[PDB]
């Protein structure tokens, strides 16, 4: 025989035509399993134990261990929180993705001149050590005695890099508190380059008790390029900077997870943990930092590497080829043409307040009342329409993505099936051709029993088997025996 | 011969390489035809003869036959209209899809206390029977004598289901009419849970004559969950509820069509009618309630089940295999991975009015004039920009969808072609191999004429044909004849 | 032998399983190269040498050579500019695509009656010949002495086509200039059909020095259909029309490029130049006017048309088939189902101005101040949110498109590979079958050396080669020789 030795407990592979045909020895192609831990090499992984990237940026009193810290990849934990002044970031997502892509928190201190104000404002919700305090990159300027002049400061950017400037605005709870910190009964912050300006004004209002405060701080940012100048004008409710952060650009990012940290080596990091990158595809999660297999939607793709399992029982002899190299060639096609994700970036504004106008005569007395009421309602209408729209965009965004994955997974399944069908037909044809080549060489001594194996009527020593293996055979030795049988 | 019996008037199938090759007996794979009628089983189909789902909800006087009605699927007719008070629904589409997905109009009456108002407001455009009337789920409260107090009512939800509350607001034609129904010269409706509030105000204005009215009613809804409370405040122009509708969730929906209703059995309902679900794909329409074949863009996919049609003429004998099972296996691949549609939901607002401010001093006299004019124009700008945006979204939405269908149809065509090519090669190979197996058995008695059939030189009775069929043949019987011919 | 004659310097083709296998004679399938020039036949190509389509429309003094000009395709140059009054078009893109799709600039003059105004306003930035001038389709009406009445004019459309009416509004630099041209200290333009109205008001403001003017003109359009009427009301800052343009619809468009113009014939025009349309796919650019090959992302797809290159050395004889027709059949599949692009249309508004309210008492004094300030900031907020949204839409738009191309290119690569694999297997099988048919005919005279060629032991004249070619051979002639060798 050449009967492929009846390998026990082989497995299923999909083909284009038949389904669940069985093969001698199969390979899996979707690494579906995770240890649950992130290696500490060869990447530089940084554990934000109880802070977020924003809180390390601002300088939280319990994250002063992250100062001038250098990451390849930032990991946020869910068990993180703020233990400082309660704050707010309009377009939070955009700021975070900028800081994330930089890969550094190198903070370079600068010489600002705050004439006619008191520096280093204190809070009891951000006690640094035993006494009152605040964030470590920001200066909370208040009135110096009983005056607050218009802070008008300038800084040219003369160097060969871009500077990132972080600033904000204070929202009081009552007008009394407003006057107590800032002599003027309303504030204004103007931040200008040669290419942009943002003017914001405080919104005095009561908000829920959070760590014993009903006031809030809104955080804004500005990006100055080599050759530009920045000009900060204000007349109250200003949180000044004390420097700029050095920007780079490259391969750096951020991933949210609750996985531990180990001492292995792995380059392929997901929120489920480390994945060996041997396989072409992985089913574990979509987000992949480093170099990773692409994402399919299925649990098993079995790529076949040898024969169907034909027999009742084994018989020794020579045999033909094995699938060998073919795996990386096909891998080439689909690897080449698959994409990288479009990154959910905008998310949403997610505002939760009544932002109407405030005066009894203006809003609830006379024709003017109705107008102002109508204006606020019109804006509410606008806001709700806006949310509807943004939601619809994000819904569509999801649909596109899901469509993509499906179609690629269908392609992947078809391709595996095509290879297995071809592979089966290749090996089958080779065996059949070789067997009948042997039949023409046999010269009537033996006959196939029907399972692609020759029933030999006579015996012969290993010399005959060698002669068959080299295709140099003559039938004279068995002439007398065959004639007697015939 | 084994000449496959020359089946007359076979048909075309697509292959990957050749086109319009012909086969013995072909199958169609796209059920393209409709009776035009909807079966009344096994689904519960409800015919909205002259009402829409919204009109059955509100309680139209000529659709009181739909009270506590239970549908699996709702069908709207185009010949439907309203014969009651002219009305308006902001975000009409959202409300309808909610009611549609429920599958019920179980209306549970509740005990509201309307102090200091007159109940059961009348209209001559909604005459119930012979005298004036209104909708059957709503209470039109008006002034009781010469007073209208602030209606402030509360209802806790103590049960184990969510309640759907339907309410509205009255838009008069003139301020005189406003004062005649409501002592206050302006109205306001505040509807609040622990999780939301909507404050709307009437827009006094003249609108086109519709069934003898220039006034309009705007319809709004609120969704209260187990444990919550609702608080309705108003000071005029209020259309109160009289209860809540019991919500479910499951498999229920709505489809617009002008098809009749029969007494067959069919589970696959489209706006063209009932479709048998035998086939894998259908070309009839995209929307499909129940279990239906997927949608392709082509008129015929012919999947092949047997040989090419080779001969000049027939000759009897045995023959080999037929395609058999293969159809459901491949069906598996593409069924598995195809998607369900993303449902056009938002559509558009589709507002058609001038919604500007109104005062001669405020809008057309002085600097104030210019400001107010500028504000209204700015809002008009906003509205038009909004429409542009929404339109662009919906345009893109269409493009995505069309792209999807094409790509899937291309996949479907490729897959059918792959199977037919393989199928042809499978059968062809089997015949050729079997024929030459027979040739080696023949031992020189007959010779192939060139059409995969043996020209036999001698005659022989059915014994010889049986001996050939079982592959147990010897040539001794025809030795003398063959020698004489040779 | 039948050894396929060892064709020197054949090339690579991709297969599904093996990669970079070699074939005798290969064909390329992506026309990747351009001359750099646009043919002047058979299409009517029009060269906008120093004007854009908008500037030819308005009647620029240096593009009076484009009057009643007829194009199949419009080409804009980058070296084009305006040398007339500085202007502005809100939704510039929409207007341009309308004019582009028409294919004509037939301007039909009409009889307007401008009572109580002075016609033919002059500018020194649009000097026509040696003296002051303006655009050639528009009438700049100013005050006649010391009065400016309300221009209220009407025109019914009684004909069997739609009319395109082009008009505008003047934005001054100072109120003094406003009063000097228009007695009223503010203007207003109302343009109404039975189906729409646009009321715009001038925005007095200083803007950058452009060719010695700080004033600007905003250009608007209106589309009147057969049976309608148009009514233009104004009280200042109005740029009147002098006629309508005849609309068509068909196959006409616009393409931006810096290519020269030749005297060849080509129907397939891209911004890189003319492309012969022989091939199925092209890699040159995406935009294609006329009939063109579809766009793939790859540099070479090699479709195979004959054998692998097997030998050490050649030997003469007959041979089998060649690939022939197969190319257009497969071309059919993918041509059929590919799409045409979704046309970037909206682009963006791209506004660059501070459009706030203006009064010292209204904006910077008292509670009113804060309100007005808040309103302008709220609108700025709205504008920025709008831009964010539009940007996100256009970003997504890009992503969809890129996804599409990839997936199609992957399909194209797979299809080429499938054909080449099949083609190789087809030819290989045919040769092998024919060779062993010849072996059974040989009757022991010759034996294959191992390269699909027969080593012949004896000699024989061309008679033997003919006898082999027709399959009518007997071994008697070589009996004595073979017996002696044996
Ligand atoms: C946090 O980072 C700051 C800034 O330095 C930056 O981060 C460091 C870790 C390194 O990566 C630096 O290359 C990088 O710029 C550290 O500030 C550094 O402090 C020293 C001591 O004050 C500075 O030396 C001074 O240099 C000036 C300028 O020549 C002299 O005039 C002084 O006499 C003195 O020699 C050093 O230059 C400064 N780095 C900068 C601005 O170049 C800081 O120590 C570091 N650690 C913290 C806060 O944890
Ligand atoms: C429309 O529906 C209402 C509400 O009932 C609901 O729909 C029915 C068709 C059934 O599906 C009900 O299970 C479902 O809740 C019908 O109202 C029903 O009316 C009867 C008679 O008034 C009520 O019986 C009363 O029950 C109360 C509470 O125990 C007693 O105090 C009374 O003495 C009396 O026995 C019945 O409970 C009520 N269903 C409800 C609220 O449970 C209504 O008849 C029906 N038909 C219409 C309008 O066409
Ligand atoms: C630019 O185009 C205008 C309008 O004509 C249009 O374009 C032409 C090139 C042709 O394609 C026309 O078929 C097309 O309508 C040209 O105006 C044409 O001018 C002549 C001479 O004034 C008009 O003839 C008159 O017709 C009227 C109406 O019957 C008589 O009352 C007059 O006595 C006279 O015969 C001709 O009709 C008019 N075309 C129109 C409106 O039908 C213009 O010459 C041309 N060239 C420019 C500006 O370069
Ligand atoms: C790896 O860790 C991630 C993060 O915990 C796991 O993601 C989670 O996967 C489950 C799948 O059932 C998600 O549940 C469902 O999500 C859908 C929306 O995607 C929602 O409609 C359902 O109601 C349900 O919540 C879960 O949200 C998701 N969590 C995330 C994204 O934070 C993932 O399963 C883990 N994988 C492995 C192999 O451990
Ligand atoms: C089943 O019934 C539906 C509903 O009547 C039929 O749908 C209709 O199909 C035609 C196809 O020509 C549509 O006409 C064209 O629609 C496109 C937009 O899709 C438009 O650009 C063209 O100007 C033209 O109107 C028609 O709109 C569409 N009607 C709908 C959706 O209500 C369908 O053809 C019927 N199918 C069969 C097999 O009877
Ligand atoms: C045909 O002419 C067009 C127009 O000049 C050429 O298009 C240009 O192609 C290059 C490719 O490198 C583009 O450069 C890159 O574009 C991307 C965005 O697509 C941008 O992110 C990169 O920073 C870089 O600018 C270039 O923009 C593009 N120009 C256009 C569209 O006007 C095209 O290459 C020419 N083709 C041939 C074969 O000559
Ligand atoms: C079945 O196929 C797998 C393919 O992974 C074979 O696994 C190899 O096993 C040898 C040791 O026997 C390792 O040195 C190789 O690295 C493994 N991988 C590869 C790439 O071949 C396995 O041996 C096969 N089993 C049988 C019975 O043939
Ligand atoms: C507020 O700040 C700006 C920028 O620092 C000042 O404008 C500069 O004023 C100086 C002195 O007159 C000029 O030499 C510069 O050319 C100005 N620069 C720019 C960019 O305008 C402005 O004077 C300051 N205003 C006040 C009231 O202090
Ligand atoms: C051609 O193929 C069709 C396949 O649908 C055959 O149709 C079958 O016909 C028999 C009766 O002759 C029915 O009992 C089957 O249910 C039909 N369907 C299937 C699934 O086979 C048809 O008979 C074939 N015709 C010929 C001449 O072979
Ligand atoms: C309007 O309605 C609300 C809710 O029913 C009333 O608020 C409740 O008032 C009672 C009596 O003072 C309190 O016990 C409740 O705690 C209040 N509930 C809530 C949710 O606020 C309110 O008093 C009513 N106002 C008027 C003027 O009648
Ligand atoms: C290799 O294939 C190409 C296919 O384009 C052959 O090109 C043909 O060449 C002849 C002249 O020899 C022209 O008349 C044809 O129009 C060409 N095109 C086609 C469609 O066949 C080329 O001759 C082939 N070379 C060899 C050596 O066989
Ligand atoms: C401004 O123009 C409109 C339209 O030309 C005038 O309205 C028409 O007036 C005439 C005379 O009274 C009527 O016969 C028409 O029926 C009106 N048409 C429409 C569409 O309203 C209007 O009179 C003009 N106003 C002024 C002040 O001149
Ligand atoms: C291998 O397969 C046989 C099938 O009968 C099964 O009984 C056996 O348990 C398998 N493997 C082992 C664990 O012996
Ligand atoms: C079957 O095909 C033949 C082709 O010649 C045609 O004449 C005949 O009409 C067909 N069917 C019938 C209706 O006889
Ligand atoms: C053909 O291929 C051979 C490979 O050795 C190369 O040397 C030769 O230069 C090629 N063509 C020509 C230019 O002679």
Author numbering:
A (entry chain A), B (entry chain B), C (entry chain C): 14 to 499
Provide excerpts from the study.
Hemagglutinin (HA) is the receptor binding and membrane fusion glycoprotein of influenza virus. HA is synthesized as a precursor, HA0, that is proteolytically cleaved during virus replication into the two disulphide-linked components of infectious virus hemagglutinin, HA1 and HA2 (1–4). Nevertheless, cleavage is essential for fusion activity. It generates the HA2 N terminus at a conserved hydrophobic sequence, which is called the fusion peptide because its synthetic peptide analogs have membrane fusion activity.
We have determined the structure of HA0 after incubating it at pH 5.0 to a global resolution of 3.95 Å. The molecular envelope is wider than that of the neutral-pH structure and extensive rearrangements have occurred throughout the molecule. The membrane-distal domains are dilated and rotated. As in the cleaved HA low-pH extended intermediate, dilation of the membrane-distal domains results in a distance of 48 Å between their centroids, compared to 35 Å in the neutral-pH structure. Refolding of the interhelical loop (HA2 residues 55 to 75) and part of helix A leads to extension of helix B from a length of 75 Å to 115 Å. The extension of helix B in low-pH HA0 (residues 50 to 125) is more limited than that seen in the extended intermediate structure of low-pH cleaved HA (residues 38 to 125), which is about 130 Å in length. The trimeric structure of the membrane-proximal region of HA0 is also opened at low pH and the C-terminal parts of the B helices (HA2 residues 100 to 125) that form a tripod at neutral pH are straightened but to a lesser extent than observed in the low-pH cleaved-HA extended intermediate. A striking feature of the structure of low-pH HA0 is the fusion peptide partially folded into an α-helix. HA2 residues 10 to 21 form a three-turn amphipathic α-helix that is positioned at the interface between two B helices and a relocated 30 loop, burying about 65% of its solvent accessible surface area. On the basis of the similarity of the extended intermediates of cleaved HA and HA0 that are formed at low pH and of the proposal that the extensions of the central helices in HA0 and cleaved HA are likely to involve a common threading path and mechanism, we have interpreted the structure of low-pH HA0 as a captured intermediate that might also be formed during the conformational change in cleaved HA at fusion pH.
